[PDB]
Symmetry: C3
Subunit: 216 residues, 3 copies
């Protein structure tokens, strides 16, 4: 019997089925493709997150990706759907091994001491996380885009988050916030025309945090 | 029987009991709260370190945290207390699983080849590690502070260290040095008044190194 | 029976036997010492890579390391030597546990979606990877050098790579590219005189990626 707990989530048709949701810095809701794989070893979680945007984004009148960059937040509630109430980024249910060991991947209470990132409970609410938010663990990477779209050095910030003011009045388990900045060097305005074939990926970004201990 | 070795250390009353010691860039001894959790998988150690300072620091006459930042070093001797002689940061004994497998977490001899960070053996000695010291692995994060205290992007550097010139003349097992820079954007001078309720945390910072192989 | 798969590779006489090959930014072939250790946990690979150069490098006429830095690429084909055709960096066969589980450490097809880093198949070919190449995961560290040689903050980029246009016409398994930038602060021109005693090491740099699942 495996000593590991595992967590895997991606759209049923894979990362190119962009049916997740991210909150932009402009408070727009963007479609996202995601692939997340995490392994728990004696309560320590190591993970990889991949996020893919298509060139179909909504920005403000006169806003240009070439000046603003692509800045957005993905939030994972590992207890979903054992806890059904919170799913900001509209994930499908994860594959968890063993079955229903989702709580193993909830960030431990010590992942948010002194202060904590607090988020509202609904996809429509304002849960954009600034890239310089207190508590973020910061990672650097070069994204990859199709054709003539060129992106500079990207940043991901991640941390535990508490979800506040749920409709039921029940305290949800903690979530993990992933906030991304992709500065754009050249190409087109990602906020203007729908170009569904034109895609940028973060590639698989590593992260690590403390959850709860799985023991077989 | 678990395939993992684990190492956990924190003050008995938790990270808010700031009875550890860090060496500042000014060679002052500051009280610190710490929480360290490490897991060994076939000789590869993955860890999380959290460090918390209160607003009770000693600096030079006329020194201001708003100009100088908070720069300090924490040193972990994983063999403590099987080896009793070295404990620069004044930790309590760790919880190690299995019991007395502390040596699993000593950095491997190949973690310090060509040159090595060398440290003196006593808390009172000069074991401050500059943030640009040769051999550091560097990580970025946003710390979190109480109230109106605001900190910019922080840096942690970590590496294996040899301890030199022990009182017994016995060569101690290697230690791990963790050196931190917290630049401060706004708030108060952390070197002036005792404000014990005013706290900054690094949050849980990930790190990885090679130790010795545990096999059940 | 261990739940882990492990991968270890280094020259037979250790990292100071610099019989590996890296491709420089000038498209020169430099001798390198390497030590790589990786552990696979339910298909997630955590690794440490150490690279050592001696002061015996070939550069262009009039090129100076003090102005250019040391910029070079190491490529690991984890299937070697089960797949014999590809070995850009001239490694010796790795120690893999269990024996012949090399494919566990091949980066998963999802490590190179949207675009992919493509490399040629022969050591003599042009497989230098720019430090700002799309798809790199980026890490920071302070290297260590002997004597009066002083290096600033280094960068490593890593990612999955496909090998293209093999002599056999067989598609090799994917490789991992490791590209390094070591800016030099002071000391001598590493491109001029042979000083075999004069060495710079990256130290052990952590990295993480998704391979294939090993189950005992």
């Amino acid at each position: 019997s495996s000593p590991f707990a595992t967590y895997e989530v991606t759209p049923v048709l894979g990362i190119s089925q962009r049916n997740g949701n991210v909150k932009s810095k402009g408070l727009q809701n963007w479609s996202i493709g995601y692939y997340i794989y995490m392994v728990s070893s004696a309560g320590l979680v190591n993970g990889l997150i991949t996020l893919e945007l298509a060139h179909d984004l909504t920005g403000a009148s006169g806003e240009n990706s070439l000046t603003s960059g692509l800045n957005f937040t993905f939030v994972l509630s590992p207890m979903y759907p054992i806890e059904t109430e919170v799913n900001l980024s509209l994930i499908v249910p994860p594959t968890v091994s063993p079955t229903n060991q989702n709580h193993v991947f909830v960030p431990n209470s010590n992942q948010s001491d002194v202060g904590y990132l607090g988020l509202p409970p609904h996809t429509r609410d304002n849960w954009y996380v600034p890239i310089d938010s207190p508590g973020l663990r910061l990672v650097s990477f070069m994204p990859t885009a199709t054709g003539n779209e060129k992106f500079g050095q990207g940043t991901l910030g991640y941390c535990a988050a508490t979800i506040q003011n749920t409709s039921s009045g029940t305290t949800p388990s903690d979530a993990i916030a992933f906030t991304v900045s992709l500065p754009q060097t050249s190409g087109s305005n990602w906020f203007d025309q729908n170009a569904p074939d034109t895609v940028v990926t973060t590639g698989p970004i590593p992260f690590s945090y403390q959850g709860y201990v799985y023991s077989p």
